[PDB]
Amino acid sequence: AITDILSAKDIESALSSCQAADSFNYKSFFSTVGLSSKTPDQIKKVFGILDQDKSGFIEEEELQLFLKNFSSSARVLTSAETKAFLAAGDTDGDGKIGVEEFQSLVKA
Secondary structure (H helix, E strand, C coil): CCCCCCCHHHHHHHHCCCCCCCCCCCCCCCCCCCHHHCCCCHHHHHHCCCCCCCCCCEEHHHHCCHHHCCCCCCCCCCCCHHHHHHHHHCCCCCCEECCHHHHHHHCC
C-alpha cells in the first residue's frame, strides 16, 4: 500500500501541479504529494512499488513506468520525463536507479 505513506488527496494534487513554471510555487511545495516532503526512510518504501519485481535496480526500461505509480492514464514516460528522472536520480548507479539514489532525488 502507498496510502499508508502518501495521501490520495496530495498525490493527484501533485501530479498536474508541478507541470508548469508557474504551477510549482511556494504553495505547490506545501501541498506536494508528500514524498518530496517526507522523512528519509519512507521514501525508499515508495520506490519498491515502482520496480516491476524488485529485481534490484530500475533501468530506463522500468523507469518509463514512473507515470504508472501515480496515474493510470499516462502510458509511459517520454523523451523528457524519463531523462529528467533517470539523469536526476541515478547517481550511485549506471543506467538505472535503486533506493539510495531514489530518496536522494525525492528529497530534492
